[PDB]
Design a protein around this nucleic acid. Structure first.
Lengths: 90, 72, 52, 107, 99
RNA sequence: UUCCCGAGCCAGGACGUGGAUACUGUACGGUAACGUAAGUGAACUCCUCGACGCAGGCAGGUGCUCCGGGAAGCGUUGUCUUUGCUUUUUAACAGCCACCCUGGAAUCAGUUUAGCUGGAGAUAGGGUUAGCUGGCUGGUAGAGCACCUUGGAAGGUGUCCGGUGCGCUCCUGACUGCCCUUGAAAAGAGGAGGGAAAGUUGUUAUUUACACCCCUGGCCGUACCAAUAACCGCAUCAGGUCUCCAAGGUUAGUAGCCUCUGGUCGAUAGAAUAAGGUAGAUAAGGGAAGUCGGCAAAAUAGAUCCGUAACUUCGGGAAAAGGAUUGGCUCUGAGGGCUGGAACAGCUAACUCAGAACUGGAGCGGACAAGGGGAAUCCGACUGUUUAAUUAAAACAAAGC
RNA sequence: GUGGUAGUAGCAAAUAUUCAAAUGAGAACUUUGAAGACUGAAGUGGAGAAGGGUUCCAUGUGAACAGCAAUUGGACAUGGG
């Protein structure tokens, strides 16, 4: 069975805090409790040890990342642009 | 504390000159017996089951060694 | 078993006997088709050697 | 029925004052202060526990014979062994790649 | 199965004339239960005396159960204060006095 | 835990006899994980232990509690009772009982209560290692315990063999989850990398924890109370004051009620039973008409089965509301484990549900325990906080903005 | 310093005592027995800390103190630990 209609992971927080605030939490709480793919081994076993720290369970390696996802999109843009700036300098 | 398991070692530990006494225990079940040499660090002890071997063994202990003690 | 399905030990044992005794009646059917599709080639190859 | 009293100076429920109910030749039930459970040597950089070498509190590692505190290998006392293979396969190859250049640097 | 022959001598009593040792034989014939049965003595149980001292023979039985039944007897004769049952050995009781 | 008897251990420092190892230079064995009676290692450097959160269940262990057999003594006995109760114990210390090799996985397989694990090498077969408060022997029966007989304190027997569990206690172990919370340091002990030194077949030299042997361990606290009488409240004051251990029955239960071990009867007494008090019960008919106001007290209450609205931030409301059943006794059915190889044959252990018959002054959550409910308005969103001794709120805080 | 108030208010929470014998000048109250109760293992039980400081233990006793009594005592005195 699916055992709630909508609220999902945030049935936890019950009948309080207000539904707009509760939804903001739902979408990024869904991110952080996810497993992500490891860069280094491949296996999708990465968990968030602490805000800004992620550990690949199978691999044993730890790496830095976002608060609530492995790769923040701003940081993905910098990895693109610094690879470009290195190439044109030669 | 410690045990001995054979007659090679028990003859050495008796003859060793800091061994004080040999208390000898006997108990009915049949007549299983214990020798115990109080040496200086440890109380060594040697279980024998047959009485006729143990009677022979008490002769093999030295006379110049001091004590012997028995229950009964 | 981990789902729910079987409530006693007896129902699991009764389930294993039902689902094994299919595969005996399967292997009666499967062995003859493996024999006959071999004998489809074996009747052919005895004929096709006798061509030359 | 029978209920007991702490024997040592510390009458509180800390780590150090861990205790173990025994009964005696008296038929009398009584504590013994067994200490904290020793962590056995997790050793780097893997941080796996080492086979061969027992959990003791670290002053009692003195009592043991030297044999017992190690493993007879290279880096045996503090290494994973598996980790050790890494050390050799590095130091073999990183010398060989460094050597192959320095013969090619004669030209 | 094996067999055990016990005893209860009444000798220090009877020579004062206070116990009748005939009475205790016929008491134990009646009152002993076998398989939760009374007066159903056959082949397991065999009760028979010198008269100086009574014997009881059994097949699963308990040394205790004889001391239970002799305490039952001594209450009916009003002799509890005078004597008590005591183990002389394994396979034996003796009757005694208080001091 | 300080005295005595017995059995050990540790720190510092060490003679001696007898073993190992080397003498053109520090032991060997195993494929390995690592091993054994020993098996040198200066300067300097790196590492480990010391060294760490909370919640959750799961498995294993100590102690407790429990059931049965055996042996002692004890109790009850007008009646019945192979019966009911007590004892049946074993210390620290000391010895022994995740990772590697072969191999190469999809018709994916292994596996937990729960998820996880696997070509960065799974299942399987064979090893190595970690461990607890596990088992056996020593310690150790000489002690302790329970009984019996002679003295007027001497001498004896016995102390045996098994179960059970979502049980209670503390501990360990590996897991799972939680955080804009990620959960001390230093003394001290040890390992490794390094190779400085010494040692030429004998008074040598490394072993001071290789085995045994030898010597020394200062200073101070240590009585007793720890509270309805040893503390603080002016007092032998119904007040206050941190920690540990924690039995049986009933029950979900460390709730309430009764009990065993241990503890206590300390609180000025005797006689009468007026009014008025203090606390506690009960009242025909009516049922808030009392009162500022249902204030006080009644009524409801457990468990099982059925049933459950407006409204809603869809999570709730909800134990909504509204009903039926429950005792005793006698039965029936369903639910495990271990042995020898279509599933059979033997031995056997739990308290948990479902249903039926009978029976009773229609009682049965029989004492104890245990929500009154519903319809609306105002304020504050919520949990949280506050005027120690007249104000707990609508006040403070709060996340969000 | 002393009255009247006045032999008055009052000594009523924590379920509870009773019978015998011994001791003594004297017993509702001390001790010993026999009964009957309570506490009911998050105990009024067994051990520590803070605080107290000899209250601990024994023998003895003329007062006062222990809101009645007292042969008892954390009181008083002499010893010991």
């Amino acid at each position: 069975a699916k055992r709630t209609k909508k609220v999902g992971v945030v049935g936890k927080y019950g009948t309080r805090y207000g539904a707009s605030l509760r939804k903001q939490v739902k979408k990024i709480e869904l991110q952080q409790h996810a497993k992500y793919s490891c860069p280094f081994c491949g296996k999708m076993a990465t968990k968030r040890q602490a805000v800004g720290i992620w550990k690949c369970r199978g691999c044993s390696k730890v790496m830095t990342g976002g608060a609530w996802t492995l790769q923040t999109a701003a940081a993905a843009t910098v990895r693109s642009t610094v690879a470009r700036l290195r190439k044109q300098a030669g | 504390a410690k045990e001995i398991r054979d007659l090679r070692k028990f003859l050495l530990t008796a003859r060793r000159p800091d061994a004080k006494r040999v208390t000898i225990v006997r108990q009915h079940k049949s007549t299983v017996t214990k020798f115990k040499i109080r040496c200086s660090r440890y109380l060594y002890t040697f279980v024998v089951e047959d009485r006729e071997k143990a009677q022979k063994l008490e002769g093999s202990l030295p006379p110049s060694l001091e004590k012997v003690s028995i229950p009964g | 078993c981990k789902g729910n399905q079987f409530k006693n030990k007896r129902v699991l044992i009764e389930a294993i006997h039902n689902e094994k005794n299919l595969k005996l009646k399967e292997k009666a059917l499967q062995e003859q088709l493996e024999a006959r599709k071999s004998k489809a080639a074996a009747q052919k190859e005895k004929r096709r050697m006798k061509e030359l | 029925a029978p209920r007991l009293v702490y024997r040592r100076h510390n009458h509180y429920a800390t780590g150090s004052n861990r205790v173990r109910r025994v009964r005696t030749p008296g038929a009398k039930v009584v504590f013994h202060n067994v200490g904290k459970q020793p962590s056995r040597p997790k050793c780097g950089n893997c941080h796996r526990a080492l086979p061969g070498i027992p959990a003791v509190a670290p002053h009692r590692l003195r009592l043991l014979k030297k044999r017992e505190r190690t493993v007879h290998r290279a880096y045996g006392g503090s290494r994973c062994h598996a980790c050790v293979r890494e050390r050799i396969v590095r130091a073999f190859l990183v010398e060989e790649q460094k050597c192959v250049k320095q013969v090619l640097q004669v030209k | 199965p094996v067999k055990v022959k016990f005893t209860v001598d009444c000798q220090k009593p009877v020579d004062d004339n206070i116990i009748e040792a005939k009475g205790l034989e016929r008491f134990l014939q009646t009152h002993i239960k076998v398989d939760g049965k009374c007066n159903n003595l056959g082949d397991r149980v065999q009760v028979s005396r010198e008269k100086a001292k009574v014997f009881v023979t059994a097949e699963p039985f308990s040394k205790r159960y004889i001391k239970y039944l002799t305490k039952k007897y001594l209450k009916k004769q009003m002799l509890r204060d005078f004597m008590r049952v005591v183990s002389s050995r394994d396979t034996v009781y003796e009757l005694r006095y208080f001091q």
